[PDB]
Ligand binder design. Structure first.
Ligand SMILES: Nc1ncnc2c1ncn2[C@@H]1O[C@H](COP(=O)(O)OP(=O)(O)OP(=O)(O)O)[C@@H](O)[C@H]1O
Ligand SMILES: Nc1ncnc2c1ncn2[C@@H]1O[C@H](COP(=O)(O)OP(=O)(O)OP(=O)(O)O)[C@@H](O)[C@H]1O
Ligand SMILES: [Mg+2]
Ligand SMILES: [Mg+2]
Ligand SMILES: [Mg+2]
Ligand SMILES: [Mg+2]
Ligand SMILES: [Mg+2]
Ligand SMILES: [Mg+2]
Ligand SMILES: [Mg+2]
Ligand SMILES: [Mg+2]
Ligand SMILES: [Mg+2]
Ligand SMILES: [Mg+2]
Ligand SMILES: [Mg+2]
Ligand SMILES: [Mg+2]
Ligand SMILES: [Mg+2]
Ligand SMILES: [Mg+2]
Ligand SMILES: [Mg+2]
Ligand SMILES: [Mg+2]
Ligand SMILES: [Mg+2]
Ligand SMILES: [Mg+2]
Ligand SMILES: [Mg+2]
Ligand SMILES: [Mg+2]
Ligand SMILES: [Mg+2]
Ligand SMILES: [Mg+2]
Ligand SMILES: [Mg+2]
Ligand SMILES: [Mg+2]
Ligand SMILES: [Mg+2]
Ligand SMILES: [Mg+2]
Ligand SMILES: [Mg+2]
Ligand SMILES: [Mg+2]
Ligand SMILES: [Mg+2]
Ligand SMILES: [Mg+2]
Ligand SMILES: [Mg+2]
Ligand SMILES: [Mg+2]
Ligand SMILES: [Mg+2]
Ligand SMILES: [Mg+2]
Ligand SMILES: [Mg+2]
Ligand SMILES: [Mg+2]
Ligand SMILES: [Mg+2]
Ligand SMILES: [Mg+2]
Ligand SMILES: [Mg+2]
Ligand SMILES: [Mg+2]
Ligand SMILES: [Mg+2]
Ligand SMILES: [Mg+2]
Ligand SMILES: [Mg+2]
Ligand SMILES: [Mg+2]
Ligand SMILES: [Mg+2]
Ligand SMILES: [Mg+2]
Ligand SMILES: [Mg+2]
Ligand code: NA
Ligand code: NA
Length: 530
RNA sequence: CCAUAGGUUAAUGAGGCGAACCGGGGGAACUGAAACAUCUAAGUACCCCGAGGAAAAGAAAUCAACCGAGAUUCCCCCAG
RNA sequence: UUUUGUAUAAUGGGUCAGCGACUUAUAUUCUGUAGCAAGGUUAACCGAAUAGGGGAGCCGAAGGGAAACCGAGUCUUAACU
RNA sequence: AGGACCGAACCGACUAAUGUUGAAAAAUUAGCGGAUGACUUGUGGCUGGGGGUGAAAGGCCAAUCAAACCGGGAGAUAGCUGGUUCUCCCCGAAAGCUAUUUAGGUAGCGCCUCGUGAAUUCAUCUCCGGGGGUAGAGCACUGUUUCGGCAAGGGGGUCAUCCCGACUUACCAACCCGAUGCAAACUGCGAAUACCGGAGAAUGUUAUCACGGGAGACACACGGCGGGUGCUAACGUCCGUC
RNA sequence: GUUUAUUAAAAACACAGCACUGUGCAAACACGAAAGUGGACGUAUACGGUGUGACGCCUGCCCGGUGCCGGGAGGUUAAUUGAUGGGGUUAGCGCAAGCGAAGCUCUUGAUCGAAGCCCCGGUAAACGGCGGCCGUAACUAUAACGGUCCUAAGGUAGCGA
RNA sequence: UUGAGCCUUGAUGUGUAGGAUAGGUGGGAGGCUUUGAAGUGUGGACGCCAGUCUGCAUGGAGCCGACCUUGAAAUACCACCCUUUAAUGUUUGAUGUUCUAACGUUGACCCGUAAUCCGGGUUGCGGACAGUGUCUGGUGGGUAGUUUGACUGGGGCGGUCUCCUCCUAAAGAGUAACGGAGGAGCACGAAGGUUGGCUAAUCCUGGUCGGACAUCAGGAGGUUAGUGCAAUGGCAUAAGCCAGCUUGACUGCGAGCGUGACGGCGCGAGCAGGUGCGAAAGCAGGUCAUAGUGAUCCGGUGGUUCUGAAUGGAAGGGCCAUC
RNA sequence: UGCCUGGCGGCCGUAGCGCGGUGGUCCCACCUGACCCCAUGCCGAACUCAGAAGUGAAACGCCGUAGCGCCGAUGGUAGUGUGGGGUCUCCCCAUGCGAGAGUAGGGAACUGCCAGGCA
RNA sequence: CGCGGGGUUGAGCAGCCUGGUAGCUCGUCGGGCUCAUAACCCGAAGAUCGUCGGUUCAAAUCCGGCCCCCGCAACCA
RNA sequence: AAAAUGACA
């Protein structure tokens, strides 16, 4: 079973995590939780050996095939989907490709023949004969068609190849699964399939997830990464959240009721110390006061960012109008004969879930995706704040966080007012010196929220604004957008964030759009969903 | 019911005292540590039991070092 | 006697006579003296025995290093002018 | 009838005097409270030491009680007090520094003494080579101070009190200039002494240094000079040197 | 009535009366290393512990703290049990390095595990506690009155230099 | 009744592309059915719901591998097994009801006995509970041993206790007071090394917002500025300010000194081995210097044939680096 | 050898500032150009290169001047080692040492080694 | 002046709790309901966070001085 | 459901 001892990673002048030593193993599944920027991804990198710790150890058995997940790479793109999911087995992939190379190079001499016979028997023991079949029976579960199973990695879509990268990790029942945010930008049906296929396995799995309904579904232990110490509570999710609460409140109460007695042994020392017949008794109360040592409270890293979008110039009457916006890439009718008029104050939630033009509507509205036919007439003064689903291009350039946030300073504000946004977004003194490239996913979504806030738009378009954000962030931004007085266009899958704030639903089905004029609860009752 | 428990008679032995030495059952504290609790004083003082002219121990399931010695007890070194 | 300092009004003693306080054992070191002198000396014990025997053993003539080890050298160091 | 009333025996002990080496290691004299009751008394018995008994005071347990008396461990320990016994000859201190559960104890060093071994070793004076920053002094610097000159600028009165300031100002006033002082924590100056080193005589029973045996002492006092504190008070208190 | 025999005889102690609490009998409680004794040759109208101290009128509010009583769902938790992992040794395969069966060993400690504590409620003739600031009435004065903060609750009847 | 282990028996473990809900080995492929059928007449359970397993029979005597699409073949079947399992057995557990036989009886009767002790015998009632022993968690002033600092203008309170800078400090060093004043318990991968260059404060005159004070251009001034941090001493050859390259913020040593009662602390040319900057002479063993810190014991981690209690190993010690 | 000039020193204001004058054959400075060898947080202003029309304006060197800076006696004063004295918070006497400020005054340097030109 | 607790709109108080948001209950002011007042409903007003300085991009918060108010304390033989 | 008050003459 995997063990870690005193990992202690540190880049800067503040503790990140200290003397982490924990045994992971035994078939238990450890949901690893924390704040949006504490330690989780750089800890599953350490557990897999991607970066060695500053000073520490990670111990694994001589043969224990780590099945870990991507989302630190996107561009393998040299071979077919079948042989892309195959190479999750780093052992079998090498023997397979090496024997193919040997077959390519002439001839099978005695060095070549004896080099190849044992590799062939190794392949047989590893059952590579039925490797592609078992890979395909998993690609079908993920949702990739049989007729294009054998297509190269350029045939696949950019939003469809993360599916294959997910399928790679859990290929052939590998013990110890390092899953790093697997359910992000996935649908309800795929999430249900994944949480069903992980429920039939005896393999320790350490999973990062910022949602509650998946951790509370699959996980057994609830390893935390807050305060610095990795506190592991054996609990589902709710018996962790109801245990840490009283664990912290007991500490607070003990400090209160132990300071309240120092304040009582102090009223005697302050009154009878100078006396002669009572100084002996007043200088033993001082010993009692000094021998108390109330224990310290360190604030949790969770916190709650203060986000609020305002609007510089409110605009009246219609804010948008879309007239005959038929468009499709290679399936033709991505959305057929769209026709709509968006008023002011609308909170339009565009639903519909998977591969259909759930996005590319927002891309056409902003204009970066030219439509096939139609014209989109924004309001006269319409200023659009765009939060793209894939926002890497704005951080590939490596500026300091301060300069990156200062790019968008407007006419009438200082770099005193620039740093206030970062302060409200919880970038304190060193995390404003990091390169913009090296930041967490949630710490990056927040940094885009602080650019929208800084620009102060009157039309907000947001492609999945609930990505890599913990409960605190999707509770702050939810009310930040609720208080918003303006036009909002957003898309999300979780049936809570969209239901909290929406006055109109426009969801597209791969044959025809359907529009509504009420909130999501009425939408479901009219659909026939209980 | 047999039988045991119990009763009577007879034969033999013991009982108490004594200075030290000896074997065993229990077992302090002052004191030293420049305070004190681990530790020392010390298995000492003292209490109790038992025997002897002495008592205990004693004839390797011991040491040694692959060379060997040969029960126990006491004295001088090893050795502060 | 104790004190920086007592005629001190600081302590002790009424006087006489007798008793009353740096000792003994074993180890170690330095001085003096005596014997022997790269040698010196025995302990227990035997012994008609303060003689003689007994040299088990102790101290000294070689040191350096934590140690193996080397040895008028040795340790340090990869090596030391 | 009565934990009833007055009052002797009987039990007790509120006040005063005497007595304090007493008649007595708690009493006598004149008064005083209870006196059929939770009373008082004779004889015998039981409870024993961290234990007894206690209408409760730490009271009583053989003139002894916040832990009896006797014997033993025992000659407990005492950084504290006292005492320490015959004679002569030579040398002869310290009451300081450092450390201390340390401050009236002790350890190392400084000072004393005995032995051994060594070089003009050491001391005084004359001459030569040195570094000061004290006394004194000075006011360029750091502060402080009083005058006089020029006065930036600043407060006050009149008028459109939008401006510009159109004015004024008996009043304040920095920086510079000339004159006059003060400073432990000021110095563009600067002694006497003292101290370090070298050379030279004369003088001094090696007075110098090293090693080894034995210590004592680490409570100081006053007087002159230089000073901190105090009141330039104290036979006050804390340092330097004699 | 008792008390410091021998400097204190009192307002101190005891008391009848009152209340709380323990005790179902081989009672609780005490003296005992234990046997056994007192309680008691008694049986809840009896016995022990604690406080108050005839009698008359009465004995207010607070369960946050500390005790005591009841509750057991949940968390933590000893001995006991010893699943796993790591190391030592070595029959052998290799005369290279090196691995290394069985056994014996050193260590690590999964699982089981009660009371207590955390938690929930009660109890004050259980130990105990019982508030600040500001304004306001026909002359002055004072506030019956009002605002607010805090507390577990803010000292009631009676008495008061 | 309910946990857990084990054994025996039977099921369940399609997505394609297949006749059809095939688990992997491979034995065979011609074998399964008449001690009485594929279908039928009819039960229940399971499910990706398409389909599988089972009682018996009026009748019943016949179904599949050969083909075929797959990486792979078939309830023709048996085998040794794997996952989820269902049932009966068997092992210890937990719980609850009964029982008597250990154990209790300070219930009744008889005897030793002329005995409200004790013992034995019948009987009744409790009954594997209570109680006792070893180990163990809680409570435990009921009891016992003890600790509860020093300086100090008497003691107590207040203040202080180690390190750095100035004055007292009497022109070498040192020098006290509960004397007068301030600081430290770090920081910096550049604020370290080298090479190349550069020189400040403060006013005086001319200009957009622009002002007494911002940037510009002249002149006076002279280090009155600056130094990561308190003060003192320094600093122009700059130790102050920029830039290029770099890691000497190296290893073993070290003549000779300074300062301490010691433990110790500090300065150091030069030597050897390997570097950096510079063309080169050369400079670099952290920073302008002085604060930024605690012995020993005990223990942890890494290296090293030094030792290894018969011998070969090992534990354990030692040494080096470090916590 | 005499004069001028350049480099390296000695010495460090009696040596430095201010005012006036003067020097271009050589030397020195300014000077022309800049693609390139090099360089500017922009600018050949600085650093650097190829040359040489002009000038001695500025800088530099030399000479003259006291308006500053600077040096500075003699005498007296203060202080002080040793020995004495007083009316002793401070002084005095014998003896030895003897400033600081100020005054008279001095004063716009002196000098070595090479290398060029005019002699 | 030795030690604590404070100074936040007119009154009484949070926010200091590890600097990025100035808030509560009552009150004042202007409307509405009412015959009229009170209550009630709506809208707004106002604080140099006692006053000075310091690192700080940013102070009420962190540090120090000064002033004011409330409690103490300044011992025994 | 909440609804208090109105000097004398
Ligand atoms: N190179 C880097 N330099 C500085 N900080 C870094 C660097 N790489 C990562 N970090 C920091 O490490 C942390 C990583 O946070 P982490 O990835 O666990 O966040 P998350 O959003 O919770 O994770 P996840 O993406 O897995 O859901 C962040 O605080 C990030 O700033
Ligand atoms: N850049 C592109 N180049 C080519 N085809 C594209 C591109 N972007 C999208 N597509 C095609 O258009 C389709 C629409 O994708 P779209 O972004 O609308 O999906 P989605 O519902 O937002 O996906 P998801 O939730 O997985 O991110 C894609 O599935 C793909 O086939
Ligand atoms: Mg006998
Ligand atoms: Mg002792
Ligand atoms: Mg002692
Ligand atoms: Mg015998
Ligand atoms: Mg004396
Ligand atoms: Mg005296
Ligand atoms: Mg005399
Ligand atoms: Mg006398
Ligand atoms: Mg005396
Ligand atoms: Mg006398
Ligand atoms: Mg006599
Ligand atoms: Mg005698
Ligand atoms: Mg030797
Ligand atoms: Mg009577
Ligand atoms: Mg009477
Ligand atoms: Mg009477
Ligand atoms: Mg009496
Ligand atoms: Mg009396
Ligand atoms: Mg009488
Ligand atoms: Mg008595
Ligand atoms: Mg006692
Ligand atoms: Mg003794
Ligand atoms: Mg004695
Ligand atoms: Mg003499
Ligand atoms: Mg003493
Ligand atoms: Mg002076
Ligand atoms: Mg002393
Ligand atoms: Mg002394
Ligand atoms: Mg003295
Ligand atoms: Mg004196
Ligand atoms: Mg009395
Ligand atoms: Mg009472
Ligand atoms: Mg009451
Ligand atoms: Mg009884
Ligand atoms: Mg006690
Ligand atoms: Mg003792
Ligand atoms: Mg004291
Ligand atoms: Mg000095
Ligand atoms: Mg001196
Ligand atoms: Mg001295
Ligand atoms: Mg530096
Ligand atoms: Mg340089
Ligand atoms: Mg430097
Ligand atoms: Mg420094
Ligand atoms: Mg061995
Ligand atoms: Mg052995
Ligand atoms: Mg070892
Ligand atoms: Na990440
Ligand atoms: Na998308």
């Amino acid at each position: 079973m995997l063990v870690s001892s005193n990992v202690t990673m540190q880049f800067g002048s503040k503790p990140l995590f200290e003397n982490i030593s924990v045994k992971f193993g035994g078939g238990n599944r450890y949901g690893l939780i924390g704040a949006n920027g504490s330690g989780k991804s750089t800890f599953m990198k350490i557990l897999g050996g991607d970066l060695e710790p500053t000073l520490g150890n990670v111990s694994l058995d001589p043969n224990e095939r780590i099945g870990k997940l991507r989302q630190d790479q996107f561009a393998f793109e040299e071979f077919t989907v079948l042989d892309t999911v195959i190479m999750g087995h780093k052992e079998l992939w090498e023997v397979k490709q090496e024997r193919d190379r040997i077959y390519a190079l002439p001839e099978m001499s005695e060095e070549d023949g004896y080099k190849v016979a044992d590799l062939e028997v190794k392949y047989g023991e590893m059952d590579g004969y039925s490797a592609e079949a078992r890979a395909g029976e998993l690609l079908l579960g993920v949702g990739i068609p049989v007729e294009q199973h054998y297509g190269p990695m350029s045939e696949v879509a950019p939003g469809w190849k993360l599916r294959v990268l997910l399928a790679q990790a859990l290929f052939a029942d590998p013990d110890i699964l390092l899953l790093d945010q697997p359910t992000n930008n996935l649908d309800i049906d795929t999430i249900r399939w994944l949480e069903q296929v992980l429920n039939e396995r005896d393999s320790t799995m350490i999973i990062i997830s910022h949602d509650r309904h998946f951790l509370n579904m699959v996980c057994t232990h609830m390893a935390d990464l807050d305060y610095g110490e990795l506190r592991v509570y054996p609990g589902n999710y709710d018996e962790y959240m109801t245990a840490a609460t009283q664990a912290r409140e007991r500490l607070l109460a003990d400090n209160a009721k132990k300071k309240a007695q120092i304040a009582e042994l102090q009223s005697f020392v302050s009154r009878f110390s100078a006396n002669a017949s009572k100084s002996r008794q007043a200088t033993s109360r001082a010993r009692q006061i000094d021998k108390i040592k109330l224990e310290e409270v360190k604030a949790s890293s969770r916190q709650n960012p203060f986000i609020r979008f305002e609007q510089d110039k409110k605009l009246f009457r219609n804010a948008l109008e879309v007239e005959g916006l038929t468009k499709g890439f290679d399936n033709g009718p991505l959305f057929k004969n769209l026709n709509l008029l968006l008023e002011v104050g609308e909170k339009l939630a565009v639903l519909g879930t998977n591969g259909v033009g759930k996005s590319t509507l927002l891309k056409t509205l902003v204009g970066d995706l030219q439509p096939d036919s139609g014209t989109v007439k924004w309001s006269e003064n319409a200023r659009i704040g765009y939060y793209a689903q894939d926002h890497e291009y704005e951080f590939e350039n490596d500026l300091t966080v301060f300069e990156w946030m200062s790019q968008w300073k407007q006419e009438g504000d200082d770099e005193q007012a620039v740093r206030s946004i970062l302060g409200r977004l919880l970038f304190s003194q060193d995390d404003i010196k990091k390169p913009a490239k090296v930041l967490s996913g949630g710490e990056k979504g927040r940094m885009l929220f602080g650019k929208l806030m800084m620009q102060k738009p009157n039309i907000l378009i947001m492609d999945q604004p609930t990505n890599h954000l913990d409960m605190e962030s999707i509770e702050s931004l939810n009310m930040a957008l609720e208080l918003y007085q303006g036009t909002l266009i957003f898309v999300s899958h979780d049936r809570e964030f969209v239901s909290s704030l929406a006055t109109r639903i426009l969801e597209i089905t791969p044959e025809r759009v359907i529009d509504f004029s009420g909130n999501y609860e009425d939408y479901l009752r009219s659909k026939g969903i209980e």
